[PDB]
Short mmCIF file of C-alpha atoms in Angstrom, two decimals:
data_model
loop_
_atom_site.label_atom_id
_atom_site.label_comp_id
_atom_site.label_asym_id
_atom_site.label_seq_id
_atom_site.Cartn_x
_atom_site.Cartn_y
_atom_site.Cartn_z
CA UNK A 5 -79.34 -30.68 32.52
CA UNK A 6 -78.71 -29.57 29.07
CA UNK A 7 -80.47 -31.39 26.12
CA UNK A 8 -77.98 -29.26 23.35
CA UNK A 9 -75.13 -31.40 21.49
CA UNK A 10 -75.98 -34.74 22.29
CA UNK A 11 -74.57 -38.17 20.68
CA UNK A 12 -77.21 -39.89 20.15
CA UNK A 13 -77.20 -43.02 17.53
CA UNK A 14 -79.85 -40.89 14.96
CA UNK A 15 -80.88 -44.40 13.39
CA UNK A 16 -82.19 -45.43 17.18
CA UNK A 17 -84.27 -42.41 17.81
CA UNK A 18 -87.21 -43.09 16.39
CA UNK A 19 -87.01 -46.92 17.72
CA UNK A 20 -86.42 -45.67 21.55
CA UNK A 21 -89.17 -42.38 20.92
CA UNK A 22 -91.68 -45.14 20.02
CA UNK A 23 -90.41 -47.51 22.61
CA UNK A 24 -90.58 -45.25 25.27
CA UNK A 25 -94.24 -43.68 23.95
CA UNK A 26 -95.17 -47.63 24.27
CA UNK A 27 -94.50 -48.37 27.77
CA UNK A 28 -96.13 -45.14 28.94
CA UNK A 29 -98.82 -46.24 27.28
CA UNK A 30 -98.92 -42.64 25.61
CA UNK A 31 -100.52 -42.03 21.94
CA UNK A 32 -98.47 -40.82 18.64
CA UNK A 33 -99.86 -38.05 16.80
CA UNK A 34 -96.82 -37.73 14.27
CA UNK A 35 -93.07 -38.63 13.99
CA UNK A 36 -91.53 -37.21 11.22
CA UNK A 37 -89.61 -35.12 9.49
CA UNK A 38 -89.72 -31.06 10.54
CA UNK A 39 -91.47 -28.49 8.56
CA UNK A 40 -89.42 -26.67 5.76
CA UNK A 41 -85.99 -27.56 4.94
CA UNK A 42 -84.74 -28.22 8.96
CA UNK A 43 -82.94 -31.01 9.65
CA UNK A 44 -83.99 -33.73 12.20
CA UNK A 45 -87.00 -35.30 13.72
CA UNK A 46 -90.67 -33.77 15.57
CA UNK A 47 -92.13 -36.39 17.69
CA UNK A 48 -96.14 -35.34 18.51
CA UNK A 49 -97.71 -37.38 21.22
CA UNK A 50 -99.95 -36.87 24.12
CA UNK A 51 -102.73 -39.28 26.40
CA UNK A 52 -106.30 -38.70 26.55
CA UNK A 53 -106.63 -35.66 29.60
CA UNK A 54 -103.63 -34.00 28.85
CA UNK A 55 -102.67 -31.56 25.74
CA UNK A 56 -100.01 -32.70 22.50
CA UNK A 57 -96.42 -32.79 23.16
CA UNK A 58 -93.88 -31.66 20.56
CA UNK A 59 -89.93 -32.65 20.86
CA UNK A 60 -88.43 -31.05 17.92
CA UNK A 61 -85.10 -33.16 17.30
CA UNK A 62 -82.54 -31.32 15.58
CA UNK A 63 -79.88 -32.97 14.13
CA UNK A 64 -76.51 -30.59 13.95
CA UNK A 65 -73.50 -30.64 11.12
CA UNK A 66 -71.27 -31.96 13.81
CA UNK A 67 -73.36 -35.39 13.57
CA UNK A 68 -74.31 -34.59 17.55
CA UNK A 69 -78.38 -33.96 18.19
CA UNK A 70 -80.31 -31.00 20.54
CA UNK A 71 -83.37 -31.92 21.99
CA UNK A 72 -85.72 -29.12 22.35
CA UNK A 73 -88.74 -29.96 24.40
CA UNK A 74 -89.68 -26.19 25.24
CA UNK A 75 -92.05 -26.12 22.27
CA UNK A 76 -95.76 -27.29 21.33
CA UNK A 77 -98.44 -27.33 24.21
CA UNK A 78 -97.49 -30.34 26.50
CA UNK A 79 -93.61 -29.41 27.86
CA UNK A 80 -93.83 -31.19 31.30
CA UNK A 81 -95.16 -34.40 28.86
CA UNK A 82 -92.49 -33.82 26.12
CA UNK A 83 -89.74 -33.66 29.07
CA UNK A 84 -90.31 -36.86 29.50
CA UNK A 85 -89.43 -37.96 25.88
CA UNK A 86 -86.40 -35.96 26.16
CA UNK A 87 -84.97 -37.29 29.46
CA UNK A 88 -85.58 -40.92 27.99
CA UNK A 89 -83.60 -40.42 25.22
CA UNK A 90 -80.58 -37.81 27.15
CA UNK A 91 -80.38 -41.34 29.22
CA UNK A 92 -79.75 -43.04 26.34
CA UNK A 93 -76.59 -41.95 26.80
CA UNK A 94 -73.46 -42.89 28.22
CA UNK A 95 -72.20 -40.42 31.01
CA UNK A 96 -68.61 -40.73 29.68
CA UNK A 97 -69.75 -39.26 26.63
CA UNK A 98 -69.94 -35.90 28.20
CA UNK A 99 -66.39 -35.71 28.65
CA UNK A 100 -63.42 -34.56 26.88
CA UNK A 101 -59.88 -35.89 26.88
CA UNK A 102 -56.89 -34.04 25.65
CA UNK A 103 -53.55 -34.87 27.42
CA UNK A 104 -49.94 -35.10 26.84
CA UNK A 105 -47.95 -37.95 28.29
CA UNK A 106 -43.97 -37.78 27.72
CA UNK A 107 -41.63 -39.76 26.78
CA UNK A 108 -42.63 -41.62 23.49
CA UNK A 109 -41.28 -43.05 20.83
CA UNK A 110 -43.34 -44.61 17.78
CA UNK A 111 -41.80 -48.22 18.07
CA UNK A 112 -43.43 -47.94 21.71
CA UNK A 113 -46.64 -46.85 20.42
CA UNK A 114 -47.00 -48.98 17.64
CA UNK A 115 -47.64 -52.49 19.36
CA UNK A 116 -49.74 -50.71 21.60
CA UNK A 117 -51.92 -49.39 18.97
CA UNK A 118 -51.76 -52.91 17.25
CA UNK A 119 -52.33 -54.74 20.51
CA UNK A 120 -55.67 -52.60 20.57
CA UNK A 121 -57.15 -53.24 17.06
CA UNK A 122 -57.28 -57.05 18.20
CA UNK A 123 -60.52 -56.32 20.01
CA UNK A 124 -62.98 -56.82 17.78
CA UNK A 125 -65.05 -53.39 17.66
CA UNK A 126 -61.33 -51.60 17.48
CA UNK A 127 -59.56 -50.66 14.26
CA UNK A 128 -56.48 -47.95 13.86
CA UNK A 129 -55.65 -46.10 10.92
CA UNK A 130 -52.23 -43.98 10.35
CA UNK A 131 -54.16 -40.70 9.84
CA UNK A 132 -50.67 -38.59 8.81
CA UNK A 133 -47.35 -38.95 8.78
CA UNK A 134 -44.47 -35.92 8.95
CA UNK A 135 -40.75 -34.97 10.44
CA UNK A 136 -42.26 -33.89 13.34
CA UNK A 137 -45.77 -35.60 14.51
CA UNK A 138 -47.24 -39.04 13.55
CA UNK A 139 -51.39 -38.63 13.90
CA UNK A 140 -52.91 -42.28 14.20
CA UNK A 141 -57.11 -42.02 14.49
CA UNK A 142 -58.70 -45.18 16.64
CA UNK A 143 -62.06 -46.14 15.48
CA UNK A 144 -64.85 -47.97 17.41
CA UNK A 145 -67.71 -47.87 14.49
CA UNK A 146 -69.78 -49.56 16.29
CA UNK A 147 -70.59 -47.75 19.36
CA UNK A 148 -69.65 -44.05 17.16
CA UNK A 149 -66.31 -43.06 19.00
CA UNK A 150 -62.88 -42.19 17.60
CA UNK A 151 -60.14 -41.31 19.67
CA UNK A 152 -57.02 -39.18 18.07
CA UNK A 153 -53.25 -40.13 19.18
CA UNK A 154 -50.20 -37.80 18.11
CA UNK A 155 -46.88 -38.45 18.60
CA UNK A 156 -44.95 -35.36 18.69
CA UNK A 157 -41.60 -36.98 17.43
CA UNK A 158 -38.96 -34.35 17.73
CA UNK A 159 -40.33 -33.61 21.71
CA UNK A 160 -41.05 -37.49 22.10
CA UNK A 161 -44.87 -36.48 23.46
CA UNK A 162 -47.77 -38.51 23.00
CA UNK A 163 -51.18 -36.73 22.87
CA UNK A 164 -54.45 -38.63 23.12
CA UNK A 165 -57.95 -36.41 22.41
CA UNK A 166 -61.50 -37.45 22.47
CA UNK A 167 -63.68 -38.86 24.87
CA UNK A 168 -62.97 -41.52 27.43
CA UNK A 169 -64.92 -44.32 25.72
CA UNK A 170 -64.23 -47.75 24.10
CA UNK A 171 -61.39 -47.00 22.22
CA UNK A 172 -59.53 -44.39 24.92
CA UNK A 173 -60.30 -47.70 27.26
CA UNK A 174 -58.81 -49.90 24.84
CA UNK A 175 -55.40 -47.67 24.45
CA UNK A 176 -54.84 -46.78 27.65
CA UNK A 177 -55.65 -50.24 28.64
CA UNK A 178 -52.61 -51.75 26.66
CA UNK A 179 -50.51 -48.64 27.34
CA UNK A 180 -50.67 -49.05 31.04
CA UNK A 181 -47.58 -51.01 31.54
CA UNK A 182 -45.37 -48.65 30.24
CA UNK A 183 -46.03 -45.64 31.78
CA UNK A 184 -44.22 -44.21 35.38
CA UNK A 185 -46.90 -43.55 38.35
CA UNK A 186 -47.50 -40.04 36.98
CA UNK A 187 -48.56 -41.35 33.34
CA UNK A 188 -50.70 -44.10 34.96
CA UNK A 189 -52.14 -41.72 37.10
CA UNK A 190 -53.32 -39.54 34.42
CA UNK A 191 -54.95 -42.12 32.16
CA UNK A 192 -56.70 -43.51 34.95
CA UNK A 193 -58.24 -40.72 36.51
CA UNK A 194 -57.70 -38.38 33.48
CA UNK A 195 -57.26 -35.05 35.64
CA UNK A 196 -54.18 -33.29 35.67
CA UNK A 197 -52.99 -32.61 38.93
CA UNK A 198 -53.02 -35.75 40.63
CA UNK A 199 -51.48 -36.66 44.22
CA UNK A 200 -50.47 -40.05 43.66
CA UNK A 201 -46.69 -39.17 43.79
CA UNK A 202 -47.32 -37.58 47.56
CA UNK A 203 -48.12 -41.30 48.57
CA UNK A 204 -45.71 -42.88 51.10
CA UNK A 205 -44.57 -45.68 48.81
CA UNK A 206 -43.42 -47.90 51.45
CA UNK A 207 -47.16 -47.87 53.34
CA UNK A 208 -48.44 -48.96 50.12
CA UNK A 209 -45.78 -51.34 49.79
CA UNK A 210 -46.72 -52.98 52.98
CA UNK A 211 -50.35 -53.40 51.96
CA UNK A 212 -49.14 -55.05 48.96
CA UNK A 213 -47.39 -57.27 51.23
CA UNK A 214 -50.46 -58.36 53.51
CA UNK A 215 -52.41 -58.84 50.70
CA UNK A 216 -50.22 -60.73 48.82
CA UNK A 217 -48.77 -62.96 51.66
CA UNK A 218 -46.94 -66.01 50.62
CA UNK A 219 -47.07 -65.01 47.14
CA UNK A 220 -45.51 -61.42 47.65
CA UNK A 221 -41.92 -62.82 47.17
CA UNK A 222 -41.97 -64.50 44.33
CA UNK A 223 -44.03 -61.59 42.59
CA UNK A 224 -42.30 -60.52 39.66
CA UNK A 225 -40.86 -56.74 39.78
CA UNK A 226 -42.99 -55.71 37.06
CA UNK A 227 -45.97 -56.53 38.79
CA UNK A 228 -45.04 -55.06 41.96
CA UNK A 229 -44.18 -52.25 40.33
CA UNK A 230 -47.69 -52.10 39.03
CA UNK A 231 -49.44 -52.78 41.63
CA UNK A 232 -48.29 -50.54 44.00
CA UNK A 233 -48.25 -47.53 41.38
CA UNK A 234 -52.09 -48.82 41.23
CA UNK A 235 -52.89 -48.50 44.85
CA UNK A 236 -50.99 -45.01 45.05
CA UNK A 237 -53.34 -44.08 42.57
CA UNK A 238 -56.15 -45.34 44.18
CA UNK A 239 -55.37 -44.27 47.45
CA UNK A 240 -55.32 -40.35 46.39
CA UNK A 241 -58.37 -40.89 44.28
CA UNK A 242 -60.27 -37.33 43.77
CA UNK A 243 -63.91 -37.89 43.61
CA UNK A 244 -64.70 -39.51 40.38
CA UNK A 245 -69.01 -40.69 39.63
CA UNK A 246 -67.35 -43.61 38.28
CA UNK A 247 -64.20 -45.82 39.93
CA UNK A 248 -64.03 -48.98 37.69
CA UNK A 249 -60.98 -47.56 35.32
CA UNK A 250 -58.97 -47.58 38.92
CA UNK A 251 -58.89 -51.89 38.11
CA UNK A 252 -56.82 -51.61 35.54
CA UNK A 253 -53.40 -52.54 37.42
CA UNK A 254 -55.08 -55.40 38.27
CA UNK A 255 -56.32 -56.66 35.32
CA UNK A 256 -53.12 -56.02 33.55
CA UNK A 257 -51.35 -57.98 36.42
CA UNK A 258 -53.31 -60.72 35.91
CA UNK A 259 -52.60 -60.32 32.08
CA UNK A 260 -49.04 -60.62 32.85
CA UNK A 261 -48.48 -63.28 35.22
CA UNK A 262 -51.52 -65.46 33.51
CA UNK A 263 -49.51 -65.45 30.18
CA UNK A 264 -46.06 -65.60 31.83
CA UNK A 265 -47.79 -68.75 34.58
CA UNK A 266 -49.27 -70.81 30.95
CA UNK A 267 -46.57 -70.30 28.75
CA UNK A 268 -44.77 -71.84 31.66
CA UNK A 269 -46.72 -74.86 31.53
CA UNK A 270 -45.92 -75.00 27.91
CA UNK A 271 -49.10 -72.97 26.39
CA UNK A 272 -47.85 -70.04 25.29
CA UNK A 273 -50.33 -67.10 24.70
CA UNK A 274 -49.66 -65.45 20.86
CA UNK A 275 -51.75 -62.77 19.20
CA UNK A 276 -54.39 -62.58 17.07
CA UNK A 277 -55.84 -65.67 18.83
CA UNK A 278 -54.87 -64.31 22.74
CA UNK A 279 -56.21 -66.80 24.65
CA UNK A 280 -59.11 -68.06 22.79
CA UNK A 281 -57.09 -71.09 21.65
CA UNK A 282 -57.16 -71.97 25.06
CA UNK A 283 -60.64 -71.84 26.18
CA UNK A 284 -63.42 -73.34 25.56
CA UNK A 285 -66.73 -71.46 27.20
CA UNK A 286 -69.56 -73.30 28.63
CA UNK A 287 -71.66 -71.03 30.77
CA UNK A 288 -70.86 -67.52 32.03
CA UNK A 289 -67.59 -68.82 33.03
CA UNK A 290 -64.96 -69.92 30.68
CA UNK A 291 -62.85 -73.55 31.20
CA UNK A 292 -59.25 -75.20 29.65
CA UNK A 293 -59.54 -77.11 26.55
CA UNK A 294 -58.56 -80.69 26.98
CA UNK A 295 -55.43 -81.02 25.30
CA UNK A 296 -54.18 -78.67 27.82
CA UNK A 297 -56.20 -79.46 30.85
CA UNK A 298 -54.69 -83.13 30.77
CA UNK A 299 -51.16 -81.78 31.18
CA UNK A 300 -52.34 -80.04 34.38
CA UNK A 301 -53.44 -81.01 37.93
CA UNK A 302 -56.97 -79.81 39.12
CA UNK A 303 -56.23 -77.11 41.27
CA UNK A 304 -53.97 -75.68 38.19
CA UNK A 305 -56.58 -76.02 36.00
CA UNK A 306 -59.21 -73.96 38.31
CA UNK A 307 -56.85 -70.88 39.62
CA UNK A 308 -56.37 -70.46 35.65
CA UNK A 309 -59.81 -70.71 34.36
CA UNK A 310 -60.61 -68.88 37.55
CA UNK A 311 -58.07 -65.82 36.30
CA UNK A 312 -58.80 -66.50 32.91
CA UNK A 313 -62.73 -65.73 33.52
CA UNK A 314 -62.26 -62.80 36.20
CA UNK A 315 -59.68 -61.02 33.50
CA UNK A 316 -62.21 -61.97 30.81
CA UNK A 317 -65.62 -60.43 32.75
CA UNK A 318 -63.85 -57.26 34.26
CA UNK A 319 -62.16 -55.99 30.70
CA UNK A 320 -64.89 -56.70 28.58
CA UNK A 321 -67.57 -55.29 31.29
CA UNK A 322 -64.85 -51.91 31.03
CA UNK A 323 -64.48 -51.86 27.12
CA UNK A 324 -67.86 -52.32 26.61
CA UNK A 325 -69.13 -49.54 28.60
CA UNK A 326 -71.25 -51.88 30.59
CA UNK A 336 -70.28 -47.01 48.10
CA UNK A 337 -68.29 -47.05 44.82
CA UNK A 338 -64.76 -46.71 45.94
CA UNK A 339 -65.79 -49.77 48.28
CA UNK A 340 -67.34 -51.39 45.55
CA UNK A 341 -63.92 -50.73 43.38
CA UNK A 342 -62.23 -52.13 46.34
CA UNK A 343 -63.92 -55.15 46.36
CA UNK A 344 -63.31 -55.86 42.77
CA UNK A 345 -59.43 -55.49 43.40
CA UNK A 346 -59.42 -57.51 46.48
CA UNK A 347 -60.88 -60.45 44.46
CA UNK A 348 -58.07 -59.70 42.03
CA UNK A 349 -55.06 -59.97 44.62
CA UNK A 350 -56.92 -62.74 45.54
CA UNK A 351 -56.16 -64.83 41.81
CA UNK A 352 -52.89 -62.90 41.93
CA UNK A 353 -51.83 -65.18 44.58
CA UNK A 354 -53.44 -67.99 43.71
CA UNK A 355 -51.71 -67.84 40.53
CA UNK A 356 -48.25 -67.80 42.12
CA UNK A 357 -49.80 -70.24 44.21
#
């Protein structure tokens, strides 16, 4: 475990130090600045029996922050301080993102990047504009994560750097639908290499099929399409720590044929306001407004709020950053489950 480089939110630190000191029930000698001109935060601290522990936190030009706990009297005791605050952090955090997906042109990316500053902790900027390469920077202030997307004009390929947090969710998320198995592929499991395309599409296909059941023929070819790109992907999975990105062909599914089921019943779904000028929320599950709801029969009304609230939960649980692969699969079972239900 390395303590060097880390993003930590600098106006927490001394909140979570004390925090953490607190529920120990450990004593505070000092927080404060460092001696000199060095930048950061020493936290001194210690419990009667044991010697002082120093945790020099330095805070680097890059705006990232190195623990050093290998300092001062008490290590073993400051180690503690330091692990609190290394998990802190988000594991995503320690990875980097920097790959090339083909076949772009700006009016593509442009309602994707617009689609994605309607969340409400995402904004976009147009960072630079030439001939040859259009640089757009997304921006999630709030948790501190931006995410830079080129478009290489004159090749037509679209570059995404940064980490895989909020916003690379976001993007990706509402870029999903366009991309072949191999794009999907990559964004999901962001390796480069995959084996999705080795997949026996017609195995898959059949799967689709059993799950699906009396709804599998009246599934619309774009969500077939999805879908089974989705369980390719999943079924030549590498080992990932975390599975839940390997959803999204589900959730945008459910996207799709909720909009495409409501608009049919004359409620069309229109940006900014999405869906919210549908719902109402009472508890941790959302229901129709009235208006609407009287147009409908019961069961209608429940596989939509159902959809509605399972699309709602999963997405904002993944945006937010809040056996796996069985757990994964449960999660997408549930989903071909509404799927279904939806076509009814």
């Amino acid at each position: 475990r390395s303590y060097k480089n880390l993003n930590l939110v600098r106006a927490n630190i001394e909140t979570e130090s004390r925090q953490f000191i607190e529920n120990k029930n450990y004593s505070i000698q000092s927080i404060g600045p460092m001696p000199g001109s060095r930048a950061g935060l020493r936290v001194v601290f210690t419990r009667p029996g044991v010697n002082l522990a120093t945790v020099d936190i330095f805070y680097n030009g890059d705006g990232s922050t190195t623990i050093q706990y290998l300092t001062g009297a008490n290590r073993s005791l400051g180690q503690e301080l330091a692990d609190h605050l290394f998990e802190t952090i988000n594991p995503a955090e320690f990875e980097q993102v920097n790959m090339v997906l083909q076949g772009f042109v700006e009016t593509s990316v442009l309602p994707v990047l617009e689609l994605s500053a309607d969340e409400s902790h995402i904004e976009f900027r147009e960072h630079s504009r030439n001939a040859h390469t259009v640089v757009w920077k997304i921006i999630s202030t709030s948790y501190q994560d931006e995410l830079t997307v080129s478009l290489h004009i004159t090749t037509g390929k679209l570059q995404i750097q940064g980490r895989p947090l909020s916003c690379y969710r976001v993007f990706t998320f509402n870029l999903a639908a366009l991309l072949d198995l191999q794009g999907l592929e990559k964004v999901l499991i962001r390796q480069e290499d995959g084996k999705a395309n080795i997949v026996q599409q017609e195995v898959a296909r059949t799967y689709l099929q059993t799950v699906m059941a009396d709804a599998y023929p009246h599934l619309h070819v774009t969500a077939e399409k999805l879908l089974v790109s989705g369980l390719c992907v999943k079924l030549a999975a590498p080992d990932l720590p975390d599975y839940c990105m390997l959803l999204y062909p589900e959730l945008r599914t459910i996207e799709g044929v909720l909009k495409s089921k409501m608009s049919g019943l004359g409620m069309p779904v229109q940006q900014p306001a999405g869906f919210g000028t549908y719902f109402d929320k009472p508890a941790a599950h959302y229901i129709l407004k009235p208006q609407f709801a009287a147009t409908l029969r019961p069961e209608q009304i429940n596989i939509i709020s159902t959809a509605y609230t399972f699309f709602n939960v999963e997405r904002h649980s993944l945006f937010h950053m809040e056996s796996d692969m069985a757990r994964l699969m449960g999660k997408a079972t549930r989903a071909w489950g509404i799927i279904k239900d939806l076509y009814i």
